Amino acid sequence: QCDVPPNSRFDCAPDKAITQEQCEARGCCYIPAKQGQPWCFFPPSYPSYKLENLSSSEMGYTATLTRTTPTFFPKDILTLRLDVMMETENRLHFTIKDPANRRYEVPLETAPSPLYSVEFSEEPFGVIVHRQLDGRVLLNTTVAPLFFADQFLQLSTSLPSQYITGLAEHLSPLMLSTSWTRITLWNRDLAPTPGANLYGSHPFYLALEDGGSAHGVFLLNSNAMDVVLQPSPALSWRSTGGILDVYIFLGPEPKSVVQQYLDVVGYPFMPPYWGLGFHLCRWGYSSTAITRQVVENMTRAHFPLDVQWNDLDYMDSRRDFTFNKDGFRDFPAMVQELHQGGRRYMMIVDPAISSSGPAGSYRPYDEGLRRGVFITNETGQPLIGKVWPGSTAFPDFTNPTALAWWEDMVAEFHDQVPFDGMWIDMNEPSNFIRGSEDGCPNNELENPPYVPGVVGGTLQAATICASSHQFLSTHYNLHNLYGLTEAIASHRALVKARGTRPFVISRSTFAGHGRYAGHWTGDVWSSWEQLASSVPEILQFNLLGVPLVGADVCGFLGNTSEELCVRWTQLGAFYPFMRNHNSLLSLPQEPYSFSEPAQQAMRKALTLRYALLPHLYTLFHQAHVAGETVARPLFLEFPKDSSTWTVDHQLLWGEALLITPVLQAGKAEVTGYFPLGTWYDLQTVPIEREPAIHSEGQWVTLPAPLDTINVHLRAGYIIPLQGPGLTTTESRQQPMALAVALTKGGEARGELFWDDGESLEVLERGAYTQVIFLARNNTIVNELVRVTSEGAGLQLQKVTVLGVATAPQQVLSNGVPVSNFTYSPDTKVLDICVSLLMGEQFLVSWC
Ligand SMILES: *[C@@H]1O[C@H](CO)[C@@H](O[C@@H]2O[C@H](CO)[C@@H](O[C@@H]3O[C@H](CO)[C@@H](O)[C@H](O[C@H]4O[C@H](CO)[C@@H](O)[C@H](O)[C@@H]4O)[C@@H]3O)[C@H](O)[C@H]2NC(C)=O)[C@H](O)[C@H]1NC(C)=O
Numbered sequence: 001q002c003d004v005p006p007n008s009r010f011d012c013a014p015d016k017a018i019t020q021e022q023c024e025a026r027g028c029c030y031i032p033a034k035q036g037q038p039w040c041f042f043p044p045s046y047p048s049y050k051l052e053n054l055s056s057s058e059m060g061y062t063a064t065l066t067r068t069t070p071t072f073f074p075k076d077i078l079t080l081r082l083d084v085m086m087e088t089e090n091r092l093h094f095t096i097k098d099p100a101n102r103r104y105e106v107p108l109e110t111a112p113s114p115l116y117s118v119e120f121s122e123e124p125f126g127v128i129v130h131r132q133l134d135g136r137v138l139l140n141t142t143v144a145p146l147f148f149a150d151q152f153l154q155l156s157t158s159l160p161s162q163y164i165t166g167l168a169e170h171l172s173p174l175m176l177s178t179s180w181t182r183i184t185l186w187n188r189d190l191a192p193t194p195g196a197n198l199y200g201s202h203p204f205y206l207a208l209e210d211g212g213s214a215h216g217v218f219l220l221n222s223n224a225m226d227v228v229l230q231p232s233p234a235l236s237w238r239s240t241g242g243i244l245d246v247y248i249f250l251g252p253e254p255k256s257v258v259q260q261y262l263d264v265v266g267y268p269f270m271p272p273y274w275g276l277g278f279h280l281c282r283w284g285y286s287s288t289a290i291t292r293q294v295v296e297n298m299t300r301a302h303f304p305l306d307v308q309w310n311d312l313d314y315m316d317s318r319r320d321f322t323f324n325k326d327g328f329r330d331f332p333a334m335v336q337e338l339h340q341g342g343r344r345y346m347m348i349v350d351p352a353i354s355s356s357g358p359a360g361s362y363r364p365y366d367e368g369l370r371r372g373v374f375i376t377n378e379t380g381q382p383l384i385g386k387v388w389p390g391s392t393a394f395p396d397f398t399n400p401t402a403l404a405w406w407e408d409m410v411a412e413f414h415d416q417v418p419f420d421g422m423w424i425d426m427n428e429p430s431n432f433i434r435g436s437e438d439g440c441p442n443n444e445l446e447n448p449p450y451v452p453g454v455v456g457g458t459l460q461a462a463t464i465c466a467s468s469h470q471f472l473s474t475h476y477n478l479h480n481l482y483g484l485t486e487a488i489a490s491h492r493a494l495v496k497a498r499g500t501r502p503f504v505i506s507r508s509t510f511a512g513h514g515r516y517a518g519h520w521t522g523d524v525w526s527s528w529e530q531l532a533s534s535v536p537e538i539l540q541f542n543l544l545g546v547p548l549v550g551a552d553v554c555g556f557l558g559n560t561s562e563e564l565c566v567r568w569t570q571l572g573a574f575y576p577f578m579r580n581h582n583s584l585l586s587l588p589q590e591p592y593s594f595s596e597p598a599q600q601a602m603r604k605a606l607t608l609r610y611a612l613l614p615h616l617y618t619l620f621h622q623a624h625v626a627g628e629t630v631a632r633p634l635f636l637e638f639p640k641d642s643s644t645w646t647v648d649h650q651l652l653w654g655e656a657l658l659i660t661p662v663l664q665a666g667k668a669e670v671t672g673y674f675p676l677g678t679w680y681d682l683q684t685v686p687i688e689r690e691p692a693i694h695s696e697g698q699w700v701t702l703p704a705p706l707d708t709i710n711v712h713l714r715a716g717y718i719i720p721l722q723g724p725g726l727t728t729t730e731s732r733q734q735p736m737a738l739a740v741a742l743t744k745g746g747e748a749r750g751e752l753f754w755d756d757g758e759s760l761e762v763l764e765r766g767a768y769t770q771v772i773f774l775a776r777n778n779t780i781v782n783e784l785v786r787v788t789s790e791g792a793g794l795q796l797q798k799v800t801v802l803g804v805a806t807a808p809q810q811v812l813s814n815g816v817p818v819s820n821f822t823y824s825p826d827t828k829v830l831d832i833c834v835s836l837l838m839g840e841q842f843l844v845s846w847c
């Protein structure tokens, strides 16, 4: 009965240190490890639930689950209801609930055969999900008991392989370790470090299968939870409340798994085009005069900058919706001037509202109080904590009245200072004291029977009381949604205030966040280690449907070095969200603050990003319309090549651009993985060392001096580019170009999506142009999928073709010889000057 292999032992003492006698008294097996692995574990006979009265309907199945022997947790729910819904060919959904009592549930809006089959074990109860095509077992919950107590749910499964990704937010390789790893989801203000619950929680994983297929599992539960991985391999979800509400996504391709997950939680929002430009911020731009010098200094040194930011500096006494009349007396004029020059403006907004001012002196608090917008305590008064301005109350973003109040405060402030988006910080919610100024009461929510592995060992640490009251439920159930709910409220507030697409960047997140907002990875150190760790983290958030993500370029905490900031700017120019931000006590790190050689390398990185913006924007359109990733790991694009599975220090933009950064000090080369095919060096395309890597699926060492980042373009792909500007207001007016990467057989395909860059409801109203580009048999053409006023007058003036094996004697554009072209026999590049329009059918040819 106790003859269970070490790797397959499921912990029967997750709640406390246990002796052999207590372990055995629980009905469990005691076998010490020989050197983590639990010593006390469940035998196969440990009491679980029994399935009874299984029945079928058009939707799927229903059954009763009954537990006869209590567990060691209090308040087992002995009778449960199972509902299995076979929702689509790719999506299976099941719930386990208490039929006698409504329990907390997360607020979320909703040959021919499915890819899955589902079977059940009777006693002990289990759900078993097979992939139909190959019979692989994807889910099998029979592997361990089902626990379902009021404040402890546990469901386990075998995993199909040792390769699993997801379960943000943590500082970790992209592929998670199955070596007895406890992953804790409890939103927490902590500078990113390994082994810790960070700012967000995403209870989703994607599991790879031998041969390159994959599936995903989403547990729709927002309670504090641990997810425990062991090397058998297997996983246990361990939550402190709510219900088991489980979605399984069948793929089979990893890209399809992500799309299927996003079909449930929401496709990524479409950012405004300007949001893809460079953003620059620090804590410490302490006046409008200083802030203005930033733009002046960037401009003088020819560095693009679309958006100027401020941190708390602008506020009056660190309070939302105010500005001080010392250094920021002329804040409105500063922002108006930014707009006059074609730039946008962003500033920090905190959730917590100063509660200490004289009554009637601070409208956000006075109005919030009147309307009852705040989270309240046991006696019904606002819970008061401590954040930047001192004593503060916390808005309840599940309360409709709070949503209306937030809209009003944002609109009123925007009437004074016309900011263009909101940077929402401190929204875990972060509290500088434990729980509240008045502590927290002693009850089961504050002192639960199972506390997940949170930093500080309590759910109150660095946040507010768990038993505090919100409109929908207690904070205990809603905590992991705090940031998400603020992001939703802010998205709506910005739509109403400005009437164009919102731009919200949030610290705290939950599953589905990307439908409303972007993310940055928080208070990272200026270290080579954190530069490297930013790659898997940005990739992870893309898999989780938050493609608008980045880290603070050059790092936030501490002092950066010139070398680190060159490499971080190079890599960071490929973050889908690119912002350099810096702490109050740090040395300056704006691009213009470095030596001339470093400035040149930083300028090159920004210039290349700006040239790529039409392509990056098209990638965001694909994310928004089809649930695609923007920055993606090699394994998403080449899953059948298992050498890609562990690669997380390279990234792709979409299908075709492979970026291989230097991520260590003192390196003048880098070794990266190249999937089978021809990869052209993007440096062979003119913008205002072998030319091609011919890979069989192999590691390649590349030169990478300080001034260089390696970027390669996949053969078979065409990328749209646009001319330069210090802002997108300027760059969007420039002529465009194509880079055409030919296969050996002369083929390539690409596309361009173009709209006005900021309007709402573009796809619904059809207010966009969409063009496909095709290379074949020594010709390049466009195909006009949709042409509207938005895309009219887009000038195509340059076409660069990579992999042209022999010099052409003539090059034609719509049947007439071009004004000129160049061919380089060494690089195999044909560069062609043309006078064409993206929105009018053309034919370019050569021979
Ligand atoms: C729910 O939240 C509300 C706030 O919205 C919170 O109100 C706070 O209650 C405490 C008392 O529990 C108040 O503190 C008092 O303040 C007065 C005047 O400033 C003092 O005179 C009081 O002193 C007493 O306690 C001292 C102990 O150190 C004794 O030495 C002294 O002799 C007095 O007996 C005391 O500090 C606080 O002012 C309010 N806060 C606000 C903003 O009004 C309430 O407690 C919360 N409820 C729960 C159950 O947590």
Ligand SMILES: *[C@@H]1O[C@H](CO)[C@@H](O[C@@H]2O[C@H](CO)[C@@H](O[C@@H]3O[C@H](CO)[C@@H](O)[C@H](O)[C@@H]3O)[C@H](O)[C@H]2NC(C)=O)[C@H](O)[C@H]1NC(C)=O
Residues within 6 Å of the ligand: 121, 123, 124, 128, 137, 140, 141, 142, 143
């Ligand atoms: C899903 O997981 C469950 C639980 O791990 C698997 O069921 C278990 O399978 C093992 C191995 O087949 C069974 O043990 C074997 O039992 C036979 C007969 O008693 C014995 O001759 C062998 O020596 C061995 O011990 C075990 O009984 C069984 N447990 C239960 C509760 O059924 C199951 O195989 C997995 N399902 C799938 C489809 O993979």
Ligand SMILES: *[C@@H]1O[C@H](CO[C@@H]2O[C@@H](C)[C@@H](O)[C@@H](O)[C@@H]2O)[C@@H](O[C@@H]2O[C@H](CO)[C@@H](O)[C@H](O)[C@H]2NC(C)=O)[C@H](O)[C@H]1NC(C)=O
Residues within 6 Å of the ligand: 052, 053, 064, 066
């Ligand atoms: C499993 O179901 C049986 C039968 O339930 C009946 O048929 C169902 C389709 C539905 O229409 C029910 O409303 C019916 O009662 C349950 O056995 C019955 O239990 C009731 C109450 O205890 C008793 O009056 C009947 O005599 C029982 N009928 C039979 C045929 O045994 C049984 O309790 C269910 N099991 C569980 C764990 O819920």
Ligand SMILES: *[C@@H]1O[C@H](CO[C@@H]2O[C@@H](C)[C@@H](O)[C@@H](O)[C@@H]2O)[C@@H](O[C@@H]2O[C@H](CO)[C@@H](O)[C@H](O)[C@H]2NC(C)=O)[C@H](O)[C@H]1NC(C)=O
Residues within 6 Å of the ligand: 558, 559, 585, 586, 587
């Ligand atoms: C980051 O650096 C600051 C400032 O460093 C100084 O100025 C630079 C130009 C360079 O010349 C450094 O070598 C200098 O030390 C640090 O702040 C200083 O800290 C020291 C030591 O604690 C203190 O004596 C100084 O007064 C501080 N000066 C200022 C202007 O703040 C800061 O400590 C560094 N941060 C970290 C994490 O190391």
Ligand SMILES: *[C@@H]1O[C@H](CO)[C@@H](O[C@@H]2O[C@H](CO)[C@@H](O)[C@H](O)[C@H]2NC(C)=O)[C@H](O)[C@H]1NC(C)=O
Residues within 6 Å of the ligand: 290, 291, 293, 294, 297, 590
């Ligand atoms: C913008 O650039 C100006 C000029 O380079 C900076 O002003 C100089 O700052 C240095 C400190 O390194 C001082 O020693 C000089 O006295 C300043 N020169 C002038 C002409 O003012 C300025 O600090 C930069 N501002 C920002 C916000 O980066």
Ligand SMILES: CC(=O)N[C@@H](CS)C(=O)O
Residues within 6 Å of the ligand: 338, 339, 340, 341, 342, 343, 344, 729
């Ligand atoms: C076009 C321009 O110069 N300014 C615009 C975009 S910043 C504006 O006033 O909002």
Ligand SMILES: CC(=O)N[C@@H](CS)C(=O)O
Residues within 6 Å of the ligand: 532, 649, 663, 664
């Ligand atoms: C941590 C890791 O796997 N790689 C690091 C150091 S080896 C890097 O890319 O620089």
Ligand SMILES: [Cl-]
Residues within 6 Å of the ligand: 018, 019, 020, 021
């Ligand atoms: Cl012991």
Ligand SMILES: [Cl-]
Residues within 6 Å of the ligand: 103, 104, 472, 473, 474
């Ligand atoms: Cl509830």
